Every structure is written in C-alpha cells, then in structure tokens.
Amino acid sequence: MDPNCSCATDGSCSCAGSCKCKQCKCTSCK
C-alpha cells in the first residue's frame, strides 16, 4: 500500500471528484 494515497488496486477506488489523497496518482486523478 501507499502512504498519502491509499487507493486500492482493484479499481473500486473510483477516486476523483472528492479525493483526499495527498499524493494520489491514479492516472486520471494524478
């Protein structure tokens, strides 16, 4: 797992539009 970003790898993260990840890099919300 990652520190700042805590998005899974299943793809159920569906972050963005309300992401609180500090260092998120899910391609889109990167």
- 11 lies in the binding site for Cd ion (CB under 5 A): no
Nearer to Cd ion, 10 or 19 (CB): 19
Sequence positions preceding breaks in the chain, C–N over 2.5 Å: none
Nearest C-alpha neighbor of 20 from the set 29, 8, 11? 29
Closest approach of Cd ion to the CB of residue 18, in Å: 9
Residue with tokens 């700042």: 4
- 8 lies in the binding site for Cd ion (CB under 5 A): no
Q: Which residues are annotated as a binding site for a divalent metal cation?
A: 5, 7, 13, 15, 19, 21, 24, 26, 29
